[PDB]
Structure 1
Amino acid sequence: EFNILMATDSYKVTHYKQYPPNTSKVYSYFECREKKYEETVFYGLQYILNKYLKGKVVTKEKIQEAKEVYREHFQDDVFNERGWNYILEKYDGHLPIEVKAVPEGSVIPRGNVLFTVENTDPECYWLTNWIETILVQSWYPITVATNSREQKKILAKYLMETSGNLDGLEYKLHDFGYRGVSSQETAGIGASAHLVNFKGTDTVAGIALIKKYYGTKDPVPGYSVPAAEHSTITAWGKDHEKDAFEHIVTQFSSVPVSVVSDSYDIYNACEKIWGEDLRHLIVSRSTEAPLIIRPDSGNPMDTVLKVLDILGKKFPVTENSKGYKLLPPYLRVIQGDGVDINTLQEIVEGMKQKKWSIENVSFGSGGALLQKLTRDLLNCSFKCSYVVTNGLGVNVFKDPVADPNKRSKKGRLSMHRTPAGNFVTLEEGKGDLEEYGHDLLHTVFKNGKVTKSYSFDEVRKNAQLN
């Protein structure tokens, strides 16, 4: 079992002895601090609240375990056993805290309060920041969802430009990051964040997380298609790549099938094997079950353009209404190597210049999509901004002399829509002046209970492109 009492940065175990005496309230907030990523998708807190913070998270056994663990870790007994016993006794192990947040899936400009946390019992003033570690990890789903959405924008722009519509956009970027992430839990969280924007993933763990913590009416929230890997092709022997291809497309003749074709010579595979030897098995396929050729090495853009050139010389090519070339409906390409937000842009731009519709190619991304992202990309930060000591409110904040960018907000915060339709975070409790509309944050957690939640369908709707 997971023990929340051990799920915090070690030093926080000693903070209850560091706050000013007589502090009855500690109020903190999370934001994606201001500076390419002007707006962020707020997604993931609901997962964390439901999996780690709700219900009876404190037990006599967990308190004892934590006590022994930290005693050795610090080689001193500094663990706040009393404080946790109080929560166990008074609230049946339910956390005396209130969390307010903008709706899951919301697209909010940088520099705005996304969620706030405060203790609901004066005795638990120390709890607000104790749970910072667990809650700040929300940076990951937020960042994956945001970076994913930004790639969707790129694809939407070029697809619209070269085809005149956005049909199939939600299937243009597939999640191939399962093996490329740091753990099983991470694979699930990341895949679910990607699914906020797209439907393609090879990590079903993401689908399970979605149905368990969010819920969806969508019959197919996440999908994938049969696909070969280097092992299934190379296993046939180098001289029998053609036999591997033929066997695979024949086995999956009525469904779309992706076939990695760069095991030995991607260009020879496209021109001679697919384009000549087995061409008769491709042109006979249905628009519903195309062959998706998959290069997986070399310069991403150059390889895609050369593959398209080869395929265009071997298969009938049409020109859509926008004047861009389109491969026959039974043949497509997927580039799943070296694809990240930067190269994605380069590839579609190159395709556009060569007059190829973006309809022809879909993409896949792994580590770049779910692993090579940090809390610094969007400056995800959790900071205390208000406390009550001696019954007096105090607006707190940090403002490092050498880095003005790390200045944090002061006092009680609230977010509002402006008259022009934008967002603004009011500080120092100025939201009380009521010069703006209602605070956009809602209480989502209070005293061990999730008080407001969202289906994944609402999350996706909230995260839609404009």
Structure 2
Amino acid sequence: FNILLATDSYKVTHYKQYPPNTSKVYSYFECREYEETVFYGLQYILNKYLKGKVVTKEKIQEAKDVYKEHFQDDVFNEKGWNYILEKYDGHLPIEIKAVPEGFVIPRGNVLFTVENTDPECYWLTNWIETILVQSWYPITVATNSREQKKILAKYLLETSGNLDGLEYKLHDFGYRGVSSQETAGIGASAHLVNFKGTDTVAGLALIKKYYGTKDPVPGYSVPAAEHSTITAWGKDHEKDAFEHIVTQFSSVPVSVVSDSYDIYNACEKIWGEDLRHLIVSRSTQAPLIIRPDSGNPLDTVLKVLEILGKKFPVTENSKGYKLLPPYLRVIQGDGVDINTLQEIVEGMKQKMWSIENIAFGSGGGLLQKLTRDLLNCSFKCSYVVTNGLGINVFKDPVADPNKRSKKGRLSLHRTPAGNFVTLEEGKGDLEEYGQDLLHTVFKNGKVTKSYSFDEIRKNAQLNI
């Protein structure tokens, strides 16, 4: 990795664009005014990309050669990068202050600030905008996952009277559906801030290396079938595939995809009749989890439950909701996003089915179908010092008041009613509010404050 090659091209040319005699460039990140966001992921970026000796003679030469060809001009700040190498042994003279990871903050608040600690590196602040703005992705996955947990918690509490097993109700199926191996790890780790069920193995090693848990692992899974393990038996031997699979995993929960040919037939005739004796004998700790994987997600879930309800002993829980026997559950793992998740749990409640009956698997909806636009994650310069005088800077486009940025030195505070407020123009310097909630997390090439994944999960807890 070469940080000199880890920026938008045009940032290579910005050192010649700032006002002459500029000694400080101070910038901030916010999720411009999903009412609240989970701050997560910056510690990964600080450690993997920004800390320690990030500048070498070889990296400067490599960047110089690439940019000469890329621009067809010599515009690269070789002097500026050589200065950091000589004066700081390649360590970045930047100070980053951030809200603690896992913190749940309303939209339009300062989440982190960045500034150069040496007047000579005024240009460095926004050089690293590209890399830091990528924190939008773990913030957005964590936020969107937590919003799904709110929906699940609400319906599980209403239909059962408690939240038991809530952290296993939304499983990450997104490994194949993301854009890269790196994204897989980051995205899966952000989902694990709220849940404990994952198939995206990449997430485990990222948490282990960059965050850490008291438990050996932050996420868990169970044995499960795929179409290849069912269909490999041949179209006429679907029952043989099912029988073999539930017998191989007779003492642990087992998920079995049942829609290869006819989901409704598999539920009613194969599970419901032919193999019913292998299901009703299963432990409460080892249910069969039937998995539909096609059709309208709500219509399929309801029809599967109505079929199962007629083949298996259903009880009525203390809330008046229908409950399958404990050796039998359903996981809907196709077409799940925050919208369909809501439609399904509402549909189940209307048909008097407890949410204890179901779990959800989500791939693209959980880890890929997200953009920087969802939370309006934005990094902007708010303060500069030029000729020894600090000036409060901002943008305010005539056609879009929503794109107006904050002015001056910023600080995040608790209000008297316990809410949040971002103080602009250095007004945090007046001791009118409590202590600033932003802490120095990075300074002059060193990570100065870190959080465990356990601390992050506690911070991200729901009120319920």
TM-score under structure 1 length normalisation: 0.99
Q: What CA distance in whole angstroms lies between the structure 1 residues aligned with 2:335 and 2:316? A: 28
Displaced runs of 4+ in structure 1, greater than 2 A? none
Alignment counterpart, residue 411 of structure 1, candidates 394, 408, 412: 408
Aligned residue runs from structure 1 range 36-435, under 5 A: 37-435=34-432
8 Å contact from structure 2 (residues 160, 318) kept in 1? yes
* 1:303 Cα deviation from its structure 2 partner: 0.4
Q: What CA distance in whole angstroms lies between the structure 1 residues aligned with 2:218 and 2:274? A: 37
8 Å contact from structure 2 (residues 175, 199) kept in 1? yes
8 Å contact from structure 2 (residues 204, 217) kept in 1? no
8 Å contact from structure 2 (residues 102, 456) kept in 1? yes
Which residue number corresponds to residue 23 of structure 1? 22
Deviations 1:130-166 (A, max 9, x none): 0000000000000000000000000000000000000
Deviations 1:275-325 (A, max 9, x none): 000000000111111100000000001100100000010000111110101
Q: What CA distance in whole angstroms lies between the structure 1 residues aligned with 2:364 and 2:86? A: 45
Q: What CA distance in whole angstroms lies between the structure 2 residues aligned with 1:69 and 1:195? A: 39
Local SS of the residue matching 2:331: strand
* 1:434 Cα deviation from its structure 2 partner: 1.3
Deviations 1:244-300 (A, max 9, x none): 000000111111110000000000000000000000000011111110000000000
Q: What CA distance in whole angstroms lies between the structure 2 residues aligned with 1:63 and 1:332? A: 58
* 1:219 Cα deviation from its structure 2 partner: 3.5
Structure 2 gap ranges (5+): none
8 Å contact from structure 2 (residues 410, 425) kept in 1? yes
Q: What CA distance in whole angstroms lies between the structure 2 residues aligned with 1:204 and 1:448? A: 30
Q: What CA distance in whole angstroms lies between the structure 2 residues aligned with 1:64 and 1:216? A: 40
Q: What CA distance in whole angstroms lies between the structure 1 residues aligned with 2:363 and 2:340? A: 13
Q: What CA distance in whole angstroms lies between the structure 2 residues aligned with 1:307 and 1:385? A: 56
* 1:72 Cα deviation from its structure 2 partner: 0.6
Q: What CA distance in whole angstroms lies between the structure 2 residues aligned with 1:359 and 1:277? A: 26
Q: What CA distance in whole angstroms lies between the structure 2 residues aligned with 1:64 and 1:258? A: 54
CA RMSD of aligned residues (A): 0.5
Q: What CA distance in whole angstroms lies between the structure 2 residues aligned with 1:288 and 1:67? A: 61
Q: What CA distance in whole angstroms lies between the structure 2 residues aligned with 1:26 and 1:409? A: 14
Q: What CA distance in whole angstroms lies between the structure 1 residues aligned with 2:389 and 2:306? A: 72
Deviations 1:233-254 (A, max 9, x none): 0011000000000000011111
Deviations 1:379-405 (A, max 9, x none): 000000000000000100000000000
Q: What CA distance in whole angstroms lies between the structure 1 residues aligned with 2:217 and 2:211? A: 15
Local SS of the residue matching 1:27: strand
Local SS of the residue matching 1:297: coil
Deviations 1:302-358 (A, max 9, x none): 100100000010000111110101111100000000110001000000100110000
Q: What CA distance in whole angstroms lies between the structure 2 residues aligned with 1:42 and 1:289? A: 36
8 Å contact from structure 2 (residues 196, 219) kept in 1? yes
Deviations 1:408-431 (A, max 9, x none): 000000000000010000000000
Local SS of the residue matching 1:145: helix
* 1:90 Cα deviation from its structure 2 partner: 0.3
8 Å contact from structure 1 (residues 397, 407) kept in 2? yes
* 1:221 Cα deviation from its structure 2 partner: 1.1
Q: Percent identity?
A: 96
Deviations 1:154-199 (A, max 9, x none): 0000000000000100000000000000000000000000000001
Which residue number corresponds to residue 461 of structure 2? 464
Q: What CA distance in whole angstroms lies between the structure 2 residues aligned with 1:219 and 1:159? A: 28
8 Å contact from structure 1 (residues 200, 222) kept in 2? yes
Q: What CA distance in whole angstroms lies between the structure 2 residues aligned with 1:290 and 1:83? A: 63
Q: What CA distance in whole angstroms lies between the structure 1 residues aligned with 2:380 and 2:457? A: 28
Q: What CA distance in whole angstroms lies between the structure 2 residues aligned with 1:192 and 1:206? A: 5
Q: What CA distance in whole angstroms lies between the structure 2 residues aligned with 1:434 and 1:300? A: 54
Q: What CA distance in whole angstroms lies between the structure 1 residues aligned with 2:250 and 2:151? A: 32
* 1:108 Cα deviation from its structure 2 partner: 0.2
Q: What CA distance in whole angstroms lies between the structure 1 residues aligned with 2:120 and 2:224? A: 57
* 1:204 Cα deviation from its structure 2 partner: 1.1
8 Å contact from structure 1 (residues 43, 138) kept in 2? yes
8 Å contact from structure 2 (residues 413, 433) kept in 1? yes
8 Å contact from structure 1 (residues 273, 279) kept in 2? yes
Q: What CA distance in whole angstroms lies between the structure 2 residues aligned with 1:107 and 1:312? A: 40
Q: Which has the larger displacement, 110-119 or 215-224?
A: 215-224
8 Å contact from structure 1 (residues 335, 362) kept in 2? yes
Q: What CA distance in whole angstroms lies between the structure 2 residues aligned with 1:172 and 1:220? A: 18
Local SS of the residue matching 1:113: coil
Q: What CA distance in whole angstroms lies between the structure 2 residues aligned with 1:254 and 1:334? A: 19
Local SS of the residue matching 1:387: strand
* 1:220 Cα deviation from its structure 2 partner: 3.5
8 Å contact from structure 1 (residues 295, 335) kept in 2? yes
8 Å contact from structure 1 (residues 267, 307) kept in 2? yes
* 1:218 Cα deviation from its structure 2 partner: 2.2
Deviations 1:413-464 (A, max 9, x none): 0000000010000000000111000100000000000000000000000000
Q: What CA distance in whole angstroms lies between the structure 1 residues aligned with 2:15 and 2:431? A: 35
Deviations 1:195-238 (A, max 9, x none): 00001111111011001000110234101110000001001100
Q: What CA distance in whole angstroms lies between the structure 2 residues aligned with 1:183 and 1:287? A: 38
Q: What CA distance in whole angstroms lies between the structure 2 residues aligned with 1:457 and 1:63? A: 39
Q: What CA distance in whole angstroms lies between the structure 1 residues aligned with 2:296 and 2:355? A: 18
Structure 1 gap ranges (5+): none
8 Å contact from structure 2 (residues 317, 323) kept in 1? yes
8 Å contact from structure 1 (residues 218, 457) kept in 2? no
Q: What CA distance in whole angstroms lies between the structure 2 residues aligned with 1:159 and 1:361? A: 10
Q: What CA distance in whole angstroms lies between the structure 1 residues aligned with 2:187 and 2:339? A: 19
In the alignment of these two chains, the number of paired residues is 463
8 Å contact from structure 1 (residues 384, 396) kept in 2? yes
Q: What CA distance in whole angstroms lies between the structure 2 residues aligned with 1:437 and 1:140? A: 30
Local SS of the residue matching 1:160: helix
Local SS of the residue matching 2:115: strand
Q: What CA distance in whole angstroms lies between the structure 2 residues aligned with 1:297 and 1:145? A: 27
TM-score under structure 2 length normalisation: 0.99
Q: What CA distance in whole angstroms lies between the structure 1 residues aligned with 2:135 and 2:366? A: 16
